[PDB]
Amino acid sequence: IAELVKLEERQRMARDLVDTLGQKLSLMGLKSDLARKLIYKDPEQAARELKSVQQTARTSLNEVRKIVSSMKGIRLKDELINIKQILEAADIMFIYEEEKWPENISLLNENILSMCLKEAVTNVVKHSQAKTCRVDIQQLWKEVVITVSDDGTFKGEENSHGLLGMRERLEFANGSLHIDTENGTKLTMAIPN
Amino acid sequence: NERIAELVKLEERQRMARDLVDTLGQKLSLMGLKSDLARKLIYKDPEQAARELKSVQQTARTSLNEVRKIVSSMKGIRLKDELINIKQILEAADIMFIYEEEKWPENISLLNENILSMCLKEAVTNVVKHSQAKTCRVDIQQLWKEVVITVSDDGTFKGHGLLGMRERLEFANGSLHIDTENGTKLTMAIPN
Ligand SMILES: Nc1ncnc2c1ncn2[C@@H]1O[C@H](COP(=O)(O)OP(=O)(O)O)[C@@H](O)[C@H]1O
Ligand SMILES: Nc1ncnc2c1ncn2[C@@H]1O[C@H](COP(=O)(O)OP(=O)(O)O)[C@@H](O)[C@H]1O
Ligand SMILES: [Ca+2]
Ligand SMILES: [Ca+2]
Incomplete structure (x- = not known):
């Protein structure tokens, strides 16, 4: 049917x-x-x-x-196709070295990771002036870890609305968000799997 | 198909x-x-x-x-099936089953059918094990914003089950009332 x-x-x-x-x-x-x-x-x-x-x-x-x-959220495979098209429209080179796709990830957790991935990339486009954006998706032992790294410059003060939204949904899933803004902006998001 | x-x-x-x-x-x-x-x-x-x-x-x-x-x-007991079950129990018990079919409650959650089914089962089991009744009447009514099941026997009250019933009806935001004036009457009510 x-x-x-x-x-x-x-x-x-x-x-x-x-x-x-x-x-x-x-x-x-x-x-x-x-x-x-x-x-x-x-x-x-x-x-x-x-x-x-x-x-x-x-x-x-x-x-x-x-x-x-x-009872529907965003699939992580579709969000990866999406953020690749967003980076292209922004003329920012998408760098992605494909490895073993995560295997046993809840649909709730795919939705959470997808929303974070979308927000991270959106920020690369709006704030970074990056030339490149690398996305890593790793199945690591009991967790899935997505790293979004841009080679632009971080424009924020000490703060965290995107970044707080990400931290909140990740910590609700008992995962975490790390941000490193020393040399471009690297966002590391980890969720149980 | x-x-x-x-x-x-x-x-x-x-x-x-x-x-x-x-x-x-x-x-x-x-x-x-x-x-x-x-x-x-x-x-x-x-x-x-x-x-x-x-x-x-x-x-x-x-x-x-x-x-x-x-x-x-993700499956509970359906109230129609439990009604059939309790009729067969009452028949094995040789306790007359009095039921007047009325309009069936139209829009009851599956969760709430499961809770009502469990309470109806326990109520009739208690009739069989404790009452020494000759008749058991079961009423099932949609009354405005609630479904109400009444189980009335003509035995005598003798006082697991009753608190289990009370907890589960209270979990569904309803209630259990026992009247032991002339036999035992359990009225169970649940929002709907
Ligand atoms: N990838 C990035 N590159 C440079 N600056 C960033 C990046 N992501 C976030 N920022 C900075 O941190 C701030 C907060 O991010 P966010 O929480 O999304 O708020 P908003 O996009 O609405 O400003 C942004 O305003 C921006 O100054
Ligand atoms: N229909 C009934 N007729 C007579 N006594 C009852 C009836 N239902 C309950 N009772 C009395 O209340 C007690 C508590 O019932 P219940 O909570 O089901 O526990 P149990 O059946 O294990 O005693 C029964 O043992 C009985 O003494
Ligand atoms: Ca943002
Ligand atoms: Ca009992």
């Missing part, structure tokens, strides 16, 4: 959401308990744990909210 | 997956609101803060327990 064949991927996305929300609920449960045990002992620390529970809740809902209707 | 049949199966599984996402989201948001409230009360009223956080813990525990069993298959 075709239209029902795409339900297979929507189902994989829905399961990923169930899995992630389950883990967040569970973490929030553990922190509320610890906080409860500090109420009298250490009320300032108790407040801080609960502020963290609140942030987990808000950020999780924030990350799930946009996916839930369609 | 040979494949289309089986793809409607994924259709129901996807509907259950969505119900779980929706319910886990709701609970996450509830626990957030309750945590924030506990936070604001740490100094004015630490006792209430403690109780709001105990309630947060309970919501976490029970939510994960209700999801745990469904997640792998």
Whole structure:
């Protein structure tokens, strides 16, 4: 029926959401308990744990909210085709040495990495004045690591809206963002896999 | 059509997956609101803060327990099937089954059918093991914004099951009421 064949991927996305929300609920449960045990002992620390529970809740809902209707996100292979066309239109040479594609990556995590990849490249175009942009995608043991390196110049002050958005979605997936702006801008994004 | 049949199966599984996402989201948001409230009360009223956080813990525990069993298959029990099951149990028990068919609830989540099915099963099991009843009446009603199942037997109340029922109905934002005035009547209600 075709239209029902795409339900297979929507189902994989829905399961990923169930899995992630389950883990967040569970973490929030553990922190509320610890906080409860500090109420009298250490009320300032108790407040801080609960502020963290609140942030987990808000950020999780924030990350799930946009996916839930369609149960569809961006595929990393398509985003790679996309950012190659963006660099070409910008006349910035795309450098990519293809290695073994990551194998067992959740659709949620592909969407997160795709959005980060898109934002990183968008910044190369808008801010870097780079001549080149190298994209590395690595399956590294238990993680996937994408490095976006441009040979332009970093234009920012100390700060981090793109960069905060990336850090937030990556840390929601228990991954991380590193930025090095010494000689061009190298963005390293790592997510569990 | 040979494949289309089986793809409607994924259709129901996807509907259950969505119900779980929706319910886990709701609970996450509830626990957030309750945590924030506990936070604001740490100094004015630490006792209430403690109780709001105990309630947060309970919501976490029970939510994960209700999801745990469904997640792998994304499949629950359908209420129509459980009604058939309980009729056959009541027949083996030689307890008269009283059921007047009315309009079936139109738009009940698969998650909520599973919860109602489990409660209906436990209610009738209790009729069979405990009541010494001769009749068992089952009513299933769409009443405005809720579905209500009533299970009434003509035995005598003798007082696992009852708290399990109460927890799962409360997880779906509904309720359990027991009336033991003249036999045992369980009214279970769930939003819909
Ligand atoms: N690849 C890059 N090359 C040079 N400067 C950058 C790069 N990425 C980000 N920046 C700098 O850091 C700032 C913050 O990035 P971002 O968070 O996307 O905000 P915005 O694009 O809306 O300025 C940018 O305004 C820019 O000054
Ligand atoms: N339909 C019923 N008729 C009579 N007594 C009941 C009925 N349902 C529950 N009870 C009483 O309440 C007790 C608690 O029931 P339940 O929670 O299901 O635990 P259990 O069946 O394991 O005792 C029963 O043991 C019984 O004493
Ligand atoms: Ca930007
Ligand atoms: Ca029982």
